[PDB]
Amino acid sequence: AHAASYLSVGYFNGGGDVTAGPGGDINKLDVTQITHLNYSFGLIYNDEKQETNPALKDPSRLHQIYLSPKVMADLQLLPVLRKQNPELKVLLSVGGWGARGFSGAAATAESRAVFIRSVQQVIKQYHLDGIDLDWEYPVNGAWGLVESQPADRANFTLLLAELHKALDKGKLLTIAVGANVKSPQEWVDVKGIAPYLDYINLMTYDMAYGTQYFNSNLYDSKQWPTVAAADRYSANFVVDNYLAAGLKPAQLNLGIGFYGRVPKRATEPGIDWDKADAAKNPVTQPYFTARETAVFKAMGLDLTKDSYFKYNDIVSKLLNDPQRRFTAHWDSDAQVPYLTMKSAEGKPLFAISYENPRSVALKADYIKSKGLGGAMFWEYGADDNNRLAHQLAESLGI
Numbered sequence: 001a002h003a004a005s006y007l008s009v010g011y012f013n014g015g016g017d018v019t020a021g022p023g024g025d026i027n028k029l030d031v032t033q034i035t036h037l038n039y040s041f042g043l044i045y046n047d048e049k050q051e052t053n054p055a056l057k058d059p060s061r062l063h064q065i066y067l068s069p070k071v072m073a074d075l076q077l078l079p080v081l082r083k084q085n086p087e088l089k090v091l092l093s094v095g096g097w098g099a100r101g102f103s104g105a106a107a108t109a110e111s112r113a114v115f116i117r118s119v120q121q122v123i124k125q126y127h128l129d130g131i132d133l134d135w136e137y138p139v140n141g142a143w144g145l146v147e148s149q150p151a152d153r154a155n156f157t158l159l160l161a162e163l164h165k166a167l168d169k170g171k172l173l174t175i176a177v178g179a180n181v182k183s184p185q186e187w188v189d190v191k192g193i194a195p196y197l198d199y200i201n202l203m204t205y206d207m208a209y210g211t212q213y214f215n216s217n218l219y220d221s222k223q224w225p226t227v228a229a230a231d232r233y234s235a236n237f238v239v240d241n242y243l244a245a246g247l248k249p250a251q252l253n254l255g256i257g258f259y260g261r262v263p264k265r266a267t268e269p270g271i272d273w274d275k276a277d278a279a280k281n282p283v284t285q286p287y288f289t290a291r292e293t294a295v296f297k298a299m300g301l302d303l304t305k306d307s308y309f310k311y312n313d314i315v316s317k318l319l320n321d322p323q324r325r326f327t328a329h330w331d332s333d334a335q336v337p338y339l340t341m342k343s344a345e346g347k348p349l350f351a352i353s354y355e356n357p358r359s360v361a362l363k364a365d366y367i368k369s370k371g372l373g374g375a376m377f378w379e380y381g382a383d384d385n386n387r388l389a390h391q392l393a394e395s396l397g398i
């Protein structure tokens, strides 16, 4: 007689993203398929010396939120989206991969107050239901991609506490957190911040690095196993790490990638940093040759720079490749699909893993069985005719 309610929180790369590229078309989204939209991204005016976005270096706006023209214009369509789905909640996500300014914004009482005032101003001007902070990452700085300091852990908590106090009742405060095991251990006081957050979005993807083949495997592959311990990740492992650190499952949304990645293992030696004279003794070697890298290059994917491939492009360019160069497979342990390309020798080479309707439904089944609060996905612009979002909505009963 009583039915559970799951969330489906769809990121949309509207403004542009360092790794996913230019922003998409908000008009193509089906907002009836989701519960929450994270419009991405607000940026942060900052004094980091390595900032290359000159707009963000305006010293009169230090620590405030920056909204690009495209972001402003898209946020103007909110009334139309709300008419199509009057239950929809819309948040602005601030930060994203490579986004500077959190370490400075969070550092002092005065800096925190400026940031918070800016958050309040943006919520009010654009009539948002809340704010999502996507700081990559406190303390670690994504290994120097953004400035960081050890005080970031404590300061993130203070920032969230003070933002929670400032926000109107009813406004949502959320964050996205990293897959890396050091996130709950060292970077983010997850127990400390939990009281201030409506939910926590887990970035349970981007695992196709180092000696790992799969990008968003639910469990570890056995057929295509990761070699170095420090690289061995799955969505469930991440979930378990956050739960071990003291978060309740109902507060968590599992991140689902509407995209795939060509693993780094295909093109770069894989180093196990636990081994003797590690860099001279790689534990995997690249298996792509110029023949393979050229196929991807011709698609528009330069594997020396990036490995991201949107799901709609996987369908149109890989699955439906007129020359039939890609073969689709299912990994029964990892519960995701992957494609192989045939080497000149005739051997299948592992090309890319991704998510399809079947694997999305299996992640929804995990959400339901593990007792998580819902799904989050990156990102709506990468879906194919809203099919993966619709699958998620069907499987979660949204």
Ligand SMILES: CC(=O)N[C@@H]1[C@@H](O)[C@H](O)[C@@H](CO)O[C@H]1O
Pocket (backbone or CB within 6 Å): 019, 142, 143, 206, 207, 209
């Ligand atoms: C797009 C992305 O997430 N890249 C990161 C990278 O910063 C990092 O070097 C590695 C762990 O060292 O984890 C990868 O997932």
